[PDB]
Amino acid sequence: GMILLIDNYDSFTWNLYQYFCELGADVLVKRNDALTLADIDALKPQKIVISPGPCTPDEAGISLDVIRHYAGRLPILGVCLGHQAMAQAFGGKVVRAAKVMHGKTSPITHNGEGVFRGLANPLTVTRYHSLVVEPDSLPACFDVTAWSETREIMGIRHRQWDLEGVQFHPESILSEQGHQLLANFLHR
Amino acid sequence: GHMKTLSPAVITLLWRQDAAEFYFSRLSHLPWAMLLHSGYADHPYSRFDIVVAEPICTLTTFGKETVVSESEKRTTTTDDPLQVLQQVLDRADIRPTHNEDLPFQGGALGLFGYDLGRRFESLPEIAEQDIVLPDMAVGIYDWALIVDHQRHTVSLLSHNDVNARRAWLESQQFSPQEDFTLTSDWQSNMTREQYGEKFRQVQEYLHSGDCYQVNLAQRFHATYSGDEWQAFLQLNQANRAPFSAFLRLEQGAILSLSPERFILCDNSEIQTRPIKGTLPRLPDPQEDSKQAVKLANSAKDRAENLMIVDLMRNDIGRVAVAGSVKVPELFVVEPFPAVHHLVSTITAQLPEQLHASDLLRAAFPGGSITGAPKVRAMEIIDELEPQRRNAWCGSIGYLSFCGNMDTSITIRTLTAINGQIFCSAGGGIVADSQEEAEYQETFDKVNRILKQLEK
Ligand SMILES: C=C(O[C@@H]1C=C(C(=O)O)C=C[C@H]1O)C(=O)O
Ligand SMILES: N[C@@H](Cc1c[nH]c2ccccc12)C(=O)O
Ligand SMILES: [Cl-]
Numbered sequence: 260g261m262i263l264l265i266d267n268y269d270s271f272t273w274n275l276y277q278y279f280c281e282l283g284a285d286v287l288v289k290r291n292d293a294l295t296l297a298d299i300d301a302l303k304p305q306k307i308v309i310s311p312g313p314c315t316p317d318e319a320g321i322s323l324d325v326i327r328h329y330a331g332r333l334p335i336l337g338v339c340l341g342h343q344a345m346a347q348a349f350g351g352k353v354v355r356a357a358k359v360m361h362g363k364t365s366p367i368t369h370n371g372e373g374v375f376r377g378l379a380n381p382l383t384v385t386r387y388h389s390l391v392v393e394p395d396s397l398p399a400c401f402d403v404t405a406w407s408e409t410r411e412i413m414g415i416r417h418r419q420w421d422l423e424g425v426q427f428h429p430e431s432i433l434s435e436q437g438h439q440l441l442a443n444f445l446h447r
Numbered sequence: 448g449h450m451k452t453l454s455p456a457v458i459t460l461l462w463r464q465d466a467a468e469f470y471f472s473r474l475s476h477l478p479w480a481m482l483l484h485s486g487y488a489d490h491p492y493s494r495f496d497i498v499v500a501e502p503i504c505t506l507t508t509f510g511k512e513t514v515v516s517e518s519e520k521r522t523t524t525t526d527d528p529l530q531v532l533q534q535v536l537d538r539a540d541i542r543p544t545h546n547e548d549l550p551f552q553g554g555a556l557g558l559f560g561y562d563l564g565r566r567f568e569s570l571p572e573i574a575e576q577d578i579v580l581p582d583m584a585v586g587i588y589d590w591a592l593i594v595d596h597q598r599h600t601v602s603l604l605s606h607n608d609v610n611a612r613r614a615w616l617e618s619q620q621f622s623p624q625e626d627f628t629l630t631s632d633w634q635s636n637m638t639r640e641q642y643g644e645k646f647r648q649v650q651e652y653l654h655s656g657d658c659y660q661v662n663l664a665q666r667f668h669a670t671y672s673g674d675e676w677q678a679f680l681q682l683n684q685a686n687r688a689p690f691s692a693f694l695r696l697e698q699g700a701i702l703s704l705s706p707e708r709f710i711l712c713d714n715s716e717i718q719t720r721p722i723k724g725t726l727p728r729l730p731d732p733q734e735d736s737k738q739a740v741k742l743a744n745s746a747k748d749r750a751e752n753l754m755i756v757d758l759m760r761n762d763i764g765r766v767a768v769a770g771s772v773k774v775p776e777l778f779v780v781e782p783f784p785a786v787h788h789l790v791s792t793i794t795a796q797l798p799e800q801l802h803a804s805d806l807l808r809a810a811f812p813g814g815s816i817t818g819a820p821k822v823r824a825m826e827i828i829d830e831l832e833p834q835r836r837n838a839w840c841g842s843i844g845y846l847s848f849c850g851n852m853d854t855s856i857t858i859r860t861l862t863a864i865n866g867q868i869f870c871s872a873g874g875g876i877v878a879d880s881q882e883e884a885e886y887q888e889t890f891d892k893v894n895r896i897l898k899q900l901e902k
């Protein structure tokens with residue numbers, strides 16, 4: 260029932276808090292420099308969410324260490340920066356997109372797996388990102404779950420563990436089926 | 448001792464549309480005299496003008512220190528200034544029930560300057576501090592004069608002898624002063640070339656993924672002589688802005704012609720109405736009608752706006768009751784004398800264990816005049832803007848003894864201090880922004896204010 264949301268000093272984190280609370284979760288929000296790994300072990304969260312934020316995973320405080328340590332131990336969802344961090348944690352690379360997309364929606368195509376279970380295809384989603392996961396260096400442990408019209412990675416999921424990323428914002432007012440998407444992570 | 452829950456005593460005065468400016472004229476020279484004015488606007492959120500003066504307590508915050516002043520007691524504290532404000536409100540022991548016709552029943556009223564945000568996040572100190580005017584300048588008032596343009600009612604309310612307050616008001620005289628005159632031309636704090644350099648640095652941060660939007664501002668300055676109240680009377684008529692205000696502070700005067708609501712809390716119903724997206728008014732009525740449609744359909748302006756809608760859902764979402772955050776309106780065009788604007792509306796509910804002061808603390812300063820993500824945007828503003836914003840792009844408003852609140856964003860706001868007057872103007876830089884268009888957007892917002900004061 261207890262979800263730890265790691266806040267990368269972002270201005271969308273509390274939209275994720277609101278959606279998970281509406282779904283009936285207990286949610287604790289902590290900034291990415293307000294916690295150590297030892298602190299997380301004492302809190303005993305059931306799942307972890309890595310929030311969006313500015314800059315790159317290297318500037319995301321404890322987020323990369325949390326991903327590496329709890330991989331296979333607790334379910335983890337990564338949103339935007341959190342998704343980039345998940346790819347980087349297993350040896351992927353984060354690069355500039357062809358076109359920045361800030362407060363613009365895009366139709367994405369998905370395979371109906373992971374957090375896309377039960378969602379219509381395609382799905383219109385809001386983007387707030389200048390960077391993407393480089394498709395060539397995506398670690399073999401990840402399946403791409405979703406693509407943009409220009410074949411940019413919009414989602415990844417680990418083949419073995421509950422460890423999943425989306426590049427877009429399910430919690431944006433113009434994203435489709437964002438409650439149901441997050442419900443998949445909460446209830447599976 | 449005795450907690451008062453009784454509704455305040457009310458004397459109804461003669462209905463006149465200009466009641467607020469009429470009575471405020473005789474108060475405008477007194478430190479801690481304050482006016483909230485709806486600008487006589489024909490607008491969905493233009494109803495009330497509110498007048499206060501002669502506070503029972505004052506709160507003045509400069510940086511880490513707040514000074515709380517009451518008749519025979521002066522206290523200083525480093526505590527969170529909005530926590531101290533809520534403590535002072537509670538200790539007044541005035542606790543009336545909400546009245547939809549008297550949204551302010553006494554309580555706190557004044558200024559939350561932009562640099563108060565340094566108390567809520569850890570921010571760099573590059574921009575210069577060249578204006579000495581408090582980060583928080585708030586009076587506590589046990590009375591008010593309320594003008595209600597919907598009911599055509601003028602109400603004088605008091606928790607402590609409304610007849611004595613009425614006789615005090617009748618005894619104050621408007622002995623008019625020399626008219627306002629500018630005594631220099633307006634000058635900016637930056638050249639077109641400097642603005643360009645700063646615009647290009649924002650675009651580098653947009654492309655690197657540091658930020659998605661930064662509001663970059665310049666500041667106009669002139670010398671002046673004569674009465675600031677006379678300047679406001681001229682500006683208020685001309686601007687028709689529903690969140691206007693005049694504050695007489697110890698240190699100088701704040702003349703606000705803001706059309707922007709920051710946060711309303713009305714019987715625990717939260718509303719925020721971020722303004723993002725602008726085009727100039729055109730003199731031909733046929734062309735101006737088409738201008739409104741152009742703004743409504745502008746992809747760049749809709750991106751600029753949407754991003755702040757998601758940011759305000761977040762900022763209100765820090766405290767809102769789970770499941771209460773809604774967006775009833777996206778991308779409505781509102782015309783003002785200088786500009787068309789794109790406005791959106793976000794609603795939520797305040798939990799019973801929280802205060803409007805907690806909602807202000809969670810959201811301040813407004814995402815509409817910073818950008819996204821907000822902490823990074825505020826770091827970039829401090830890096831690029833040569834002087835701190837002080838009163839400009841803060842908030843003016845009230846925290847009622849009943850729990851209600853209303854606040855502006857102090858855009859289109861002048862600071863008049865030591866015979867100097869300052870007027871700032873900015874705009875949201877996003878990926879599709881162009882350098883010259885954004886420079887001209889700053890002028891479009893304040894050109895009519897600057898030019899009206901040159902005459
Ligand atoms: C800072 C200002 O701009 C702000 C941003 C707007 C825009 O960029 O279109 C419009 C209203 C304001 O919230 C200003 O009014 O001076
Ligand atoms: N327009 C507001 C009152 C108001 C006028 N100016 C303001 C400045 C700040 C806050 C509120 C106000 C109303 O009708 O209720
Ligand atoms: Cl502090």
Ligand SMILES: [Cl-]
Binds near residue numbers: 596
């Ligand atoms: Cl009227």
Ligand SMILES: [Mg+2]
Binds near residue numbers: 723724751875888
């Ligand atoms: Mg703009």
Ligand SMILES: [Mg+2]
Binds near residue numbers: 802
């Ligand atoms: Mg209380």
